[PDB]
Curated annotation (Swiss-Prot), chain A:
The chain holds residues 100 to 195 of 198 of the full protein. Component of the chloroplast ribosome (chloro-ribosome), a dedicated translation machinery responsible for the synthesis of chloroplast genome-encoded proteins, including proteins of the transcription and translation machinery and components of the photosynthetic apparatus. This is Large ribosomal subunit protein uL23c. Two forms of the protein exist; they have the same N-terminal sequence and approximately the same molecular weight. Component of the chloroplast large ribosomal subunit (LSU). Mature 70S chloroplast ribosomes of higher plants consist of a small (30S) and a large (50S) subunit. The 30S small subunit contains 1 molecule of ribosomal RNA (16S rRNA) and 24 different proteins. The 50S large subunit contains 3 rRNA molecules (23S, 5S and 4.5S rRNA) and 33 different proteins. It is found in: Plastid, Chloroplast. Belongs to the universal ribosomal protein uL23 family. It comes from Spinacia oleracea.
From Swiss-Prot, chain B:
This is Large ribosomal subunit protein bL34c. Its main location: plastid. It comes from Spinacia oleracea. GO terms for cellular component: chloroplast; mitochondrial large ribosomal subunit. The keyword rRNA-binding applies.
UniProtKB/Swiss-Prot annotation, chain C:
It comes from the Eukaryota. Residues 30-49 are annotated as: Disordered. It comes from Spinacia oleracea. This is Large ribosomal subunit protein cL37 gamma. Coiled coil: none annotated. The chain holds residues 94 to 142 of 142 of the full protein.
UniProtKB/Swiss-Prot annotation, chain D:
SUPFAM superfamilies: Nucleic acid-binding proteins (SSF50249), Translation proteins SH3-like domain (SSF50104). SMART domains: Ribosomal_L2, Ribosomal_L2_C. It comes from Spinacia oleracea (Spinach). The lineage of its organism: Eukaryota, Viridiplantae, Streptophyta, Embryophyta, Tracheophyta. This is Large ribosomal subunit protein uL2cz/uL2cy. It is found in: Plastid, Chloroplast. One of its GO terms (biological process) is mitochondrial translation. It comes from the Eukaryota. It holds the Pfam family Ribosomal_L2_C. Residues 202-253 are annotated as: Disordered. One of its GO terms (molecular function) is transferase activity. The keyword Ribonucleoprotein applies.
RNA sequence: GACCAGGCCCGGGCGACUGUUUACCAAAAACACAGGUCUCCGCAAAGUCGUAAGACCAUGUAUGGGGGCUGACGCCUGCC
RNA sequence: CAGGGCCUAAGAUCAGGCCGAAAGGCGUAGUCGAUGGACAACAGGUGAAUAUUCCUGUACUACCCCUUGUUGGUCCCGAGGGACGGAGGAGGCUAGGUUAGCCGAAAGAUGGUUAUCGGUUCAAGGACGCAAGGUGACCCUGUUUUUCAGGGUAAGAAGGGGUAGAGAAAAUGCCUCGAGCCAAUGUUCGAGUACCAGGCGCUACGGCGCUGAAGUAACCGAUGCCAUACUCCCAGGAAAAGCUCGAACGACCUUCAACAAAAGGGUACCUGUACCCGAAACCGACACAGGUAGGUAGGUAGAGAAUACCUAGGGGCGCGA
RNA sequence: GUGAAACUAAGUGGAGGUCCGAACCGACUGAUGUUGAAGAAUCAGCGGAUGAGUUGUGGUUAGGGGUGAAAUGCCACUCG
């Protein structure tokens, strides 16, 4: 009916804070074709899906959030089967 | 069957903050006097028993 | 004319009994989830307990 | 006699819950609490729906009063409960109105009742609903009527005036043998939500005007006393000048 | 054949009985009780709580609601 | 999956309203409030630390998308439903268990012996289906009434249709059609190149790669399921939403707009998720001979969830000599 | 059995603040303990165990008060 209000009012450019690079994440990339991104706590899944779908220009299958005990949202972004993960891994500077 | 000293048992944090919680001190006048009084002494924590409605400390 | 009514009412009965029965397993599954030995796998590790 | 039906729209669960606690939450009316959950039957005391022909379908148990209650139908399909009159049997027909036969379960103003009749379910106020003689085996004779006022003898024996335009129902209230029950055990009281009562003489002097003397107390009180300090026996508590007084003639004996 | 698993009989007092109770020195012969009886109360009831509004009693109505004493059942309950 | 985006109980707050030195007290609609209603997912695999969440299989809800079919739909309102105790026993069943049968291995330095040791597993879901079960009025005759056999009666069951009164649906009254109905469980798909006894090879000698036989039957049998099914009892056993139905009144929206359907594709809100939880992690000032709701319930004896000895699994009590 | 009824074996039925006894709730006797393993316990026995039962979660009543099957008991090891 009306304009679609996003769940909160955020500024999208601040929501994806960074890739998390450790031994854990990299094999998640290998197996599952899923990136690992620390994101703003106040940020949701619909916002992360639009953000990354537009930003790197990839269609994303599914997103899974998490909240650390430290209060920092952590998101698994598993892309489609078409777009390889390791592609975006070399594009971003995450080296498997 | 439990010793007299057991007065504080394991009770749902939800229930406690529905008693000593913040939003309850705000209801009464005497509670507001409470909070002025604690702010005067300048305690780090105003309401000891409190609780996130949802979050890491949330009771469902 | 009686065969029409009988096949219509058996169509209806098959439907209502389908939905009914479906509903029933759903409820059973719920009661089990509440009580807490649900996922049949769970129950089969503990059978011998 | 007693057979459970499904629930008619007349039976609800909404109610006061704490029995004998008021607003402040204090126990006011003592000794209540415990006892089986109950549902409210919506009785029709007014019987105000006139001139249609009602039919007793069944007779049912009610937890709330010691009388019985009857589910009655109409041709219109409305269903009401009424108090069960004494001697009424399923299949019977009842009606309310002004000009009506006089038989069991019919309801009429006191203008039309032949003197000497035995009545129950008696409004003291026009359209307020029936009030007097609602318990098991309760009945009141209409002795005389004069002016705008009719005279009754209430089941307490008290003779009293009421308005001649107040509706009432013929026949005595059913289930007469209920006080012939003998409960037999403590549990049977507790089922009714009536908790145990402590005799005055037993409690400590702080708790009650007959307080602990050494061994066992005679009541030294020069008089038997309420928990609250008033003479217990034969002190009339009726409000002296209460508006009702012109109406009341002889007092229950 | 281990473990498991009633000692019983004859008397008397008190209280009929199952129950309840002094958390941490008393579990009883105390309290309760079914039952009994007295008194109040005709519904804007009496009683209880409130400065009051009102709430309980009760969405009940004298075969019902307060309050006081006694305490199953049996025999009784004298005089002033 | 558990709460929130759904609904109400006790109870709480309470617009206006009533009262009260003040603060406030009572109280109506409203709104909160789960310990209850409603509502859709399971098996295997990975796994330093998560898994009904990640992977592979089959699933299921709610929306959107198209085709087709209708023209009014939506809320407010009227209703049906949701919706309810205790006790008792009898059924009909599974879960489990035990023994056979099948398959593989076995020599365990003793007098004898293969009588021995392991394996025989699979979920939610979808299609079918229901008798020796349970219920389906009366009358006559017999079987102990019962399970039955013949006849007859004409609504006589789930379940439907019609009419009548101010009367849409509903309730209520009259008329009519129907001998089946109920639901655990069962058969089949799901499901096999899954899983797995062993076998082969490596050993960082921790674990790993490789190939895999048989996979049925009988008898015990629940406190679980049918089931709010019965029968009996008095002390007489929650509300509201989703759900099903529907005229007048009011409000709003209206044509490729809305609603109705069977396929097909698509789409997928927050918060919890570690670990402990008959506890050295909660509650007892302690790494304290204590307290702490619920679930699952193997073997031999036994009336038994008692007891004794054991399996799975877990331990040898944080001072010794 | 008589015409009605009473009376009496039989079966069926499954009542009970019934009985025995685990879980669970208690707390009767003893022993130990007493700078305790423990600010009320362990050990062996003991009472109730379909009810006036036990318990969970969420609530109510507050100090000239509350609650009390009544002990001046209880109201956060505090209660004339
Ligand atoms: Mg991972
Ligand atoms: Mg922010
Ligand atoms: Mg999450
Ligand atoms: Mg603290
Ligand atoms: Mg076991
Ligand atoms: Mg009802
Ligand atoms: Mg109903
Ligand atoms: Mg209050
Ligand atoms: Mg008495
Ligand atoms: Mg007494
Ligand atoms: Mg005393
Ligand atoms: Mg008091
Ligand atoms: Mg005094
Ligand atoms: Mg005295
Ligand atoms: Mg003396
Ligand atoms: Mg013994
Ligand atoms: Mg014995
Ligand atoms: Mg003796
Ligand atoms: Mg003597
Ligand atoms: Mg002597
Ligand atoms: Mg005694
Ligand atoms: Mg006994
Ligand atoms: Mg007690
Ligand atoms: Mg003591
Ligand atoms: Mg005690
Ligand atoms: Mg004792
Ligand atoms: Mg006592
Ligand atoms: Mg009054
Ligand atoms: Mg009386
Ligand atoms: Mg009395
Ligand atoms: Mg006495
Ligand atoms: Mg006597
Ligand atoms: Mg005698
Ligand atoms: Mg309410
Ligand atoms: Mg208020
Ligand atoms: Mg106001
Ligand atoms: Mg309200
Ligand atoms: Mg809520
Ligand atoms: Mg819940
Ligand atoms: Mg759910
Ligand atoms: Mg939900
Ligand atoms: Mg783990
Ligand atoms: Mg799994
Ligand atoms: Mg999935
Ligand atoms: Mg599979
Ligand atoms: Mg669906
Ligand atoms: Mg409605
Ligand atoms: Mg229920
Ligand atoms: Mg059975
Ligand atoms: Mg089997
Ligand atoms: Mg053998
Ligand atoms: Mg053989
Ligand atoms: Mg040998
Ligand atoms: Mg074998
Ligand atoms: Mg199946
Ligand atoms: Mg299908
Ligand atoms: Mg059959
Ligand atoms: Mg109609
Ligand atoms: Mg019509
Ligand atoms: Mg009809
Ligand atoms: Mg058998
Ligand atoms: Mg049992
Ligand atoms: Mg159980
Ligand atoms: Mg029933
Ligand atoms: Mg209109
Ligand atoms: Mg429709
Ligand atoms: Mg987890
Ligand atoms: Mg876990
Ligand atoms: Mg230690
Ligand atoms: Mg310990
Ligand atoms: Mg312990
Ligand atoms: Mg066993
Ligand atoms: Mg034995
Ligand atoms: Mg056996
Ligand atoms: Mg044992
Ligand atoms: Mg072992
Ligand atoms: Mg030594
Ligand atoms: Mg028997
Ligand atoms: Mg007993
Ligand atoms: Mg014996
Ligand atoms: Mg003692
Ligand atoms: Mg002991
Ligand atoms: Mg014992
Ligand atoms: Mg014994
Ligand atoms: Mg004994
Ligand atoms: Mg016993
Ligand atoms: Mg019983
Ligand atoms: Mg309870
Ligand atoms: Mg307790
Ligand atoms: Mg007590
Ligand atoms: Mg303190
Ligand atoms: Mg204390
Ligand atoms: Mg003391």
């Amino acid at each position: 009916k009306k304009l679609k209000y996003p769940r909160r009012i955020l500024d999208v450019y601040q929501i994806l804070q960074s890739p998390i690079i450790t031994e854990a994440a990299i094999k998640n990339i290998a197996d599952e074709n899923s990136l690992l991104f620390t994101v703003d706590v106040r940020a949701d899944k619909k916002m992360i899906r639009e953000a990354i779908s537009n930003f790197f220009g990839v269609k994303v299958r599914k997103v899974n959030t998490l909240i650390r005990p430290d209060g920092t949202k952590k998101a698994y972004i598993m892309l489609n089967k078409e777009y390889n993960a390791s592609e975006l891994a070399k594009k971003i500077g995450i080296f498997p | 069957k439990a010793a007299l000293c057991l007065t504080k048992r394991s009770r749902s944090r939800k229930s406690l903050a529905r008693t000593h919680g913040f939003r309850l001190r705000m209801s009464t006048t005497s509670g507001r006097a409470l909070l002025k009084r604690r702010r005067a002494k300048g305690r780090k924590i105003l309401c000891t028993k409190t609780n996130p409605s949802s979050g890491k400390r949330a009771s469902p | 004319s009686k065969l029409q009514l009988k096949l219509e009412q058996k169509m209806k009965m098959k439907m209502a009994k389908k939905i009914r029965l479906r509903r029933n397993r759903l409820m059973r599954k719920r009661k089990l989830r509440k009580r807490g030995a649900w996922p049949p796998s769970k129950m089969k590790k503990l059978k011998n307990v | 006699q007693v057979k459970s039906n499904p629930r008619n729209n007349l039976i609800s669960g909404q109610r006061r819950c704490g029995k004998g606690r008021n607003a402040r939450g204090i126990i006011t009316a003592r000794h209540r609490g415990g006892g089986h959950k109950r549902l409210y039957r919506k009785i029709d005391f007014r019987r105000n729906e006139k001139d249609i022909y009602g039919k007793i379908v069944t007779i049912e148990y009610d937890p709330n009063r010691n009388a019985y209650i009857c589910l009655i139908h109409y041709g219109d399909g409305e269903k009401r409960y009424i108090l069960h009159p004494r001697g009424a049997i399923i299949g019977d027909t009842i009606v309310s109105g002004t000009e009506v036969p006089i038989k069991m379960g019919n309801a009429l103003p006191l203008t039309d009742m032949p003197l000497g009749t035995a009545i129950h379910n008696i409004e003291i106020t026009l359209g307020r609903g029936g009030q007097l003689a609602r318990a098991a085996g309760a009945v009141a004779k209409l002795i005389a009527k004069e002016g705008k006022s009719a005279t009754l003898k209430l089941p307490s024996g008290e003779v009293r005036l009421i308005s001649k335009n107040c509706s009432a129902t013929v026949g005595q209230v059913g289930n007469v043998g209920v006080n012939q029950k003998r409960l037999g055990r403590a549990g049977s009281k507790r089922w009714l939500g009536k908790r145990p009562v402590v005799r005055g003489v037993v409690m400590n002097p702080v708790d009650h005007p007959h307080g602990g003397g050494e061994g066992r107390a005679p009541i030294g009180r020069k008089s038997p006393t309420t928990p609250w300090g008033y003479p217990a026996l034969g002190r009339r508590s009726r409000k002296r000048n209460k508006y009702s007084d012109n109406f009341i003639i002889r007092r229950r004996s």
